[PDB]
Amino acid sequence: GSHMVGQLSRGAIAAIMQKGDTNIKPILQVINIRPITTGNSPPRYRLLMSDGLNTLSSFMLATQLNPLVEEEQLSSNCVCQIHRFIVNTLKDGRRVVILMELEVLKSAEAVGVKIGNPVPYNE
């Protein structure tokens, strides 16, 4: 209940990005989900996620998790626990976090709002 930001793994985004910590199972909130253009391939979803302290816009859902989005279990405001993820670095140096396994801990309807006031993580 109270102190809502205590529901989220504050500091997890920086740990994933600064340290590359991959054994953690962080609890994050979905801020927004959007499709990205893929031409002739199954849809891909990019997620803006929050750990309570920071937001990060470069999470990518593994396509095997697409049905969570299409059947609306995974939507803006929901709180989820990431169980398996990998970090990948692009040619230009940017990094993306691919979500492989996750569990929705609380529905968008049960949470209802963006938790706290996280700020964009830079790099």
> How many residues belong to the site for ligand 1FJ (CB under 6 A)?
9
Contacts from 87-93 at CB under 8 Å and sequence distance 24+? 87/16, 87/17, 87/20, 87/22
Q: In what helix (H) or strand (E) does residue 93 lie, and over which residues does it extend? A: none
Q: State which of residues 14, 15, 60, 69 lies at the interface with ligand 1FJ (CB under 6 A).
A: 60
Choice from 18, 22, 88, 117 touching ligand 1FJ (CB under 6 A): 88
For residues 54 and 119, the answer to whether their CB atoms sit within 8 Å is yes
| Per CB under 6 A, 22 contacts ligand 1FJ | no
Enumerate binding residues for ligand 1FJ (CB under 6 A).
36, 38, 44, 60, 62, 86, 88, 96, 98
